[PDB]
């Protein structure tokens, strides 16, 4: 989530974060709910866009 | 399971005469045994057999 890259053995990883749709929830700047796979565009900065892969915090 | 409804079946898995049925409803309930998986890990008897 920080933006860095790491290399670790498969054993060292804790576990997959299995999250239900009731847990993986995203809210945009305006407050409209955005779900998995939707396309959003960055409001500022590079103003890039893409499809959501996973939502965390 | 089939996408129909099983609520018209009796205790023995057979529908009773006089019951109105529609398409895709289940009139005979039958199950075949399957070797259980490793779900006995932490399933409280709720594992598919």
């Amino acid at each position: 989530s920080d933006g860095k890259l790491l290399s670790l053995p498969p054993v060292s990883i804790y576990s997959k974060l299995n999250l239900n749709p009731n847990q993986q929830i995203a809210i945009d700047s305006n407050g409209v709910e955005v779900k998995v796979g939707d396309t959003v565009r960055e409001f500022t900065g590079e103003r890039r866009q893409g499809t959501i892969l996973h939502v965390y915090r | 399971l089939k996408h129909g409804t099983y609520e018209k079946l009796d205790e023995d898995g057979l529908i009773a005469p006089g019951v109105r049925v529609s398409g895709d409803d289940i009139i005979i309930g039958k199950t075949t045994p399957i070797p259980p998986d490793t779900e006995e890990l932490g399933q409280r008897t709720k594992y598919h057999t």
Binding site: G3, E46 | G42, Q43, R44, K46
Partner: protein, 300 residues
């Protein structure tokens, strides 16, 4: 200083936002906060920011060295000589500044790195410094018999697994509770397992992956308080068997390690997790040793 990449990428949520516009930060105070300087260096290496070291009294040193070097003549020839000397001195300063800046930067980097190294060493030592749990009416260092109960998640269809280990460190018996943990049947079966089979565990550990485990912990504590399940003491206020939460980084890593699979080829993953919890309670140091390489991935 900020590059265009720094001008665009340093967001209010990014960790680099703490020094987006820092200025005139004292060097002597940096050693007390090594992580700030390390993060500044990391941001610099990303092509976002530029770290600059400057002296408020640089002009004072330049003027003093010029006064030492300059001639005292007043003729126009002496004026030209002094001008040549001053210009060469300024060029020498221009050449010299970057090397001194780099040397000072490397010195501060080494100091901060050593400080953070010592800090991490102390944190790890604090993490791994804990003797095994001492049961009452026993001397310190005695290995207690432990019982671990866990169900993992608590979704509809989550049975509670129980694993008991003696002081010898060898698994004695594993049991499954397939009824609901809130039913009277669950409590009765757990009481029968605790009492009838002469298991007599010295401490009971409870752990899980979410908040659902809290309800199990409360239910177990209520059961212990209700049935007066006092510890058996080898031959009189008999003491109750303690029920606590257990830290489970080593247990989580052990449930995925192939060492457990070789040790227990016919056991579920939750059984391995409970065994790891029990071994951690018996001896945290040996469990931390069992991590081998994965210990370096722990949050220290």
């Amino acid at each position: 200083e900020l590059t265009e990449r720094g001008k665009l990428q340093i967001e209010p949520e990014s960790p680099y936002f703490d020094f987006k516009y820092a200025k005139n930060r004292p060097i002597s105070a940096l050693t007390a906060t090594p992580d700030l300087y390390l993060r500044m260096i990391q941001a610099e290496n990303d092509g976002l920011v530029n770290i600059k070291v400057e002296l408020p009294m640089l002009s004072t040193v330049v003027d003093h060295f010029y006064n030492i070097l300059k001639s005292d003549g007043t003729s126009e020839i002496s004026e030209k000589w002094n001008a040549l000397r001053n210009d060469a001195w300024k060029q020498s300063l221009d050449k010299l500044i970057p090397l001194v800046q780099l040397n000072v930067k490397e010195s501060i980097r080494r100091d901060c790195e050593r400080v953070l190294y010592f800090q991490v060493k102390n944190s790890f030592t604090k993490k791994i410094d804990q003797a095994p749990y001492q049961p009452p009416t026993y001397a310190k260092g005695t290995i207690p018999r432990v019982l671990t109960l866990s169900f993992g998640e608590g979704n509809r269809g989550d049975a509670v697994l129980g694993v008991f280990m003696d002081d010898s460190g060898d698994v004695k018996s594993q049991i499954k509770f397939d009824e609901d943990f809130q039913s009277r049947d669950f409590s009765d079966s757990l009481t029968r397992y605790i009492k009838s089979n002469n298991i007599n565990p010295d401490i009971i550990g409870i752990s899980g992956f979410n908040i659902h485990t809290k309800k199990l912990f409360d239910k177990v504590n209520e059961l212990v308080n209700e049935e007066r399940l006092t510890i058996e003491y080898d031959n009189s206020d008999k003491h109750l068997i303690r029920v606590i939460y257990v830290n489970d980084e080593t247990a989580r890593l052990y449930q995925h390690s192939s060492k457990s699979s070789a040790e227990y080829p016919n056991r579920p993953q939750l059984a391995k997790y409970c065994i790891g919890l029990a071994k951690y309670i018996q001896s945290p140091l040996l469990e931390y040793l069992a991590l081998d390489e994965s210990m370096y991935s722990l949050h220290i």
